[PDB]
Design a protein around this ligand. Structure first.
Ligand SMILES: Cc1cc2nc3c(=O)[nH]c(=O)nc-3n(C[C@H](O)[C@H](O)[C@H](O)COP(=O)(O)O)c2cc1C
Ligand SMILES: Cc1cc2nc3c(=O)[nH]c(=O)nc-3n(C[C@H](O)[C@H](O)[C@H](O)COP(=O)(O)O)c2cc1C
Lengths: 122, 122
């Protein structure tokens, strides 16, 4: 489902943002474009070092939002583009999804987002 | 209270993310590092073209989260750093805050975030 333009964004560096529902409002954490791994089945894997508040939020509501982009990829009306990703999150500490990010030796886990929609929003 | 490292980040391009409280989960939208205008009094101003869902969310709860960063600025984890900003948001459609982004002729409003806290998170 993820489009070619998305993979082009991933070729460039940038700040990824991951929003979850917290008790008193949204919560928002980050990773880097270059840290993301994409798997078959529309899955995006993030290396987790911290994200303890994020993990607790995911346990109460697995639905998350992710944005990322790059000024170096042409958008619909001008330089740069990016995406809003909606999907369901789960945390893994072993298995192939963990092996995707295991080169990051500080990772205590893998955050795996199963994408339901990806919208190019610029 | 925005620290010097934050302004270093703004010398570099990137994707800014802004999270708001939706009816049933967070909402998350973006701008570019290069579009932000910082004013005295801890104010970050964002040119608004769209952000109608975000505006309705700000009406329900003025508290927002913003993240931004840059690989080109040193952090505490080698190359790269970024910030979690918490603040109160308002949409301005007149006045000096609107004029600060009014060269963007596509702007219908300025999203003004009055920063309460800035945390360097990498
Ligand atoms: C640009 C950037 C990159 C980040 N990359 C990671 C990452 O890959 N993994 C991670 O666990 N935290 C990363 N962080 C830190 C998280 O955003 C977050 O502050 C931390 O994991 C704590 O999460 P929590 O607030 O959900 O407990 C990054 C921060 C920034 C600014
Ligand atoms: C990297 C990037 C930058 C964007 N810059 C802006 C911007 O400066 N102002 C704007 O209104 N929308 C911008 N957008 C679009 C918003 O993220 C959002 O999709 C749109 O304004 C609709 O907001 P809403 O979902 O709150 O209605 C940008 C999107 C991307 C991917």
């Amino acid at each position: 489902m993820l489009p070619g333009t998305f993979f082009e964004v991933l070729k460039n560096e940038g700040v990824v943002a991951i929003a979850t529902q917290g008790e008193d409002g949204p919560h928002l954490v980050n990773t880097w474009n270059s840290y993301l791994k994409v798997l078959d089945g529309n899955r995006i894997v993030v290396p987790v070092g911290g994200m303890h508040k994020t993990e607790a939020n995911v346990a109460r509501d697995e639905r998350v939002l992710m944005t990322l982009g790059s000024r170096k990829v042409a958008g619909r009306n001008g330089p740069g583009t990016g995406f809003l990703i909606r999907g369901s999150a789960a945390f893994r500490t072993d298995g192939p999804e963990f092996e995707a990010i295991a080169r990051f030796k500080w990772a205590r886990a893998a955050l795996v987002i199963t994408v339901v929609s990806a919208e190019q929003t610029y």
